[PDB]
């Protein structure tokens, strides 16, 4: 297994890193792998985001 690359976003909602961030680890845990890195996308607002692009890797 290699590590898989991974994007979601949200066309409704603006949010913060500590949503996005959620939503990758639990995305990658979901996939019996672990977040390793991530990268919030399309800035909103003045501290939000609309999406995030992230790595999962095998235990
Ligand atoms: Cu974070």
Known sequence: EACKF???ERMDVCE???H??????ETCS???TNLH???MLL???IDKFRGVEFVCCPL
């Open 6 to 8: 991974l994007h979601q």
């Open 16 to 18: 913060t890193h500590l």
């Open 20 to 25: 996005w961030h959620t939503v990758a680890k």
């Open 30 to 32: 979901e996939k019996s």
């Open 37 to 39: 890195d991530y990268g």
């Open 43 to 45: 800035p909103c607002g």
